[PDB]
Structures are given as structure tokens and as C-alpha cells.
Design a protein around this nucleic acid. Structure first.
Length: 248
DNA sequence: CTTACGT
DNA sequence: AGTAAG
């Protein structure tokens, strides 16, 4: 089965990812920026208890670490933690947006390629490391009033809610898949951040190309959702479109 | 929580 | 001058 054949490639079996070929990212600030420290709006016990197991898992995974930082932005409970990084985003230097819009991306799908595999990378941003010099930027406060600990945590990986994460991830995965494209010039590979479409001429070519892509992704440290994967189908859902007999 | 359009 | 998103 596709599951047991590629244990490293699936999030279900391969552990949390880590893009081992990608250097830890340095996040340049705008020329005039200084740190901003926003105090944490008090959180209800219900919200804190809802968020806590997620924080603990991220700590265990090394994705969060304790820190002391002159930067601080608030968490809101939505329960899962959502960080309001808008004041950090304002102080970080802009980069050119290189993620194509889905309409244009899909124009690169020729009618000769009607066998599809769609993969969704799990916890994609967390696969990219942050350089230690840039980690303090993203700090937030975490307290356990029944455990005594009251200090800051920050991210060791590219965080959710940071304005440049989608573009930085898209560019990093493009670098890591450049050789795959060269070794498989008969295949079409569309990348939209963490959403991938592979297109082939035939069921066999799609099967072989999908095996090659899963092997490559897992080897590089990325992880795809086995649950959501659409493997070697003539009909798939990709980026909100239904892809059927060349249409859409 | 806070903060950035259309009647 | 009463929605969506971090």
C-alpha cells in the first residue's frame, strides 16, 4: 500500500518534518525597526486549558522554546493558539510575493496530462527552521498558574501568522524540488505553498512519478497527509477546483 | 483580544 | 460615522 511503501513521506508515520537541506531562515527587519512588546491580554482558564496541550506538544517537539525577548505579541484563543503578529509584520522588511495565484498556476496544466496526484504537506511552515538570531522576534507570553512558570516562549520554525511564511515556504520547496523536476521532465508539478499537484500522461507514469515524489519529499524532511492524499486519479480536487477531463 | 467597507 | 483576520 501507499502507506507502508513510504513511511517517511506521510505525516501519519514519519514524525514531524524538518527540511534538512534548508539553512535556518534569517528574517531581516526594516531599517528603522525596534522591538515591540505588547502585553498579553488576560486569558480565561477555559481558553488556557484548551490551548495548553498544544503548547506542550510544540515544546516537546522543540518547535517552541523558552526565551527572554524584547519582542512580545499576544496569543488569542480561537481552542487552538493564534498569535497576533501584526506588529511584528509591520517591522519586518517586505519581500516580493512570488506565490502564483491559483488561476495562473492552473494554466500550466496541459490537456495531455490527465492522471493526477494531489498531496497536502502537513505542518509545512514548521518544517523550515528559523535562525537563532531571528527566533526572538516571534516571542509570546505563556503562564501555567498551577505550575508556576510565567515567562516567554518563541518559535524555532517559521511561524503561522507571519506575513512572509507562505512565500518563504514556497521558495524553499521550489529549491528542494528543483532536481526532481529535472529528473522527471515528462511530469507536471504545480506548487502552491503546501498544496502540490503532480500530473502525468498515464496511470503507470503517475504511479511511478508519485512514488518518486513521495520518496523525495520524505527524504528532504517534508510530510504529506496520508488521509487527504488523492493518488493517481483522473478526477481530483485541487485549490478549490474540481479537475475533471481537462476542465477547470 | 485588537485592528484594518459600505450604507 | 455597524465583517475579516492576526
Amino acid at each position: 500500500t501507499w502507506l507502508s511503501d513510504f513511511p517517511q513521506a506521510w505525516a501519519e508515520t514519519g514524525g514531524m518534518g524538518l527540511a534538512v537541506r534548508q539553512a535556518p531562515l534569517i528574517i531581516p527587519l526594516k531599517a528603522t525597526s525596534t522591538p515591540v512588546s505588547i502585553k498579553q491580554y488576560p486569558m480565561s482558564q477555559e481558553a488556557r486549558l484548551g490551548i495548553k496541550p498544544h503548547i506542550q506538544r510544540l515544546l516537546d517537539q522543540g518547535i517552541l522554546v523558552p526565551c527572554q525577548s524584547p519582542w512580545n505579541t499576544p496569543l488569542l484563543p480561537v481552542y487552538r493558539p493564534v498569535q497576533d503578529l501584526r506588529e511584528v509584520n509591520k517591522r519586518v522588511e517586505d519581500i516580493h510575493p512570488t506565490v502564483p495565484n491559483p488561476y495562473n498556476l492552473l494554466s500550466g496544466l496541459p490537456p495531455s496530462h490527465q492522471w493526477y496526484t494531489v498531496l497536502d504537506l502537513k505542518d509545512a511552515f514548521f518544517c523550515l527552521r528559523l535562525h537563532p538570531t531571528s527566533q526572538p522576534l516571534f516571542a509570546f507570553e505563556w503562564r501555567d498558574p498551577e505550575m508556576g512558570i510565567s515567562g516567554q516562549l518563541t518559535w524555532t520554525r517559521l511561524p503561522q501568522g507571519f506575513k512572509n511564511s507562505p512565500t518563504l515556504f514556497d521558495e524553499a520547496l521550489h529549491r528542494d524540488l528543483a532536481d526532481f523536476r529535472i529528473q522527471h521532465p515528462d511530469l507536471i508539478l504545480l506548487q502552491y505553498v503546501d498544496d502540490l499537484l503532480l500530473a502525468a500522461t498515464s496511470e503507470l507514469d503517475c504511479q511511478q512519478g508519485t512514488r518518486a515524489l513521495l520518496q523525495t519529499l520524505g527524504n528532504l524532511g517534508y510530510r504529506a497527509s496520508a488521509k487527504k492524499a488523492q493518488i493517481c486519479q483522473k478526477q481530483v480536487k485541487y485549490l478549490g477546483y474540481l479537475l475533471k477531463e481537462g476542465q477547470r
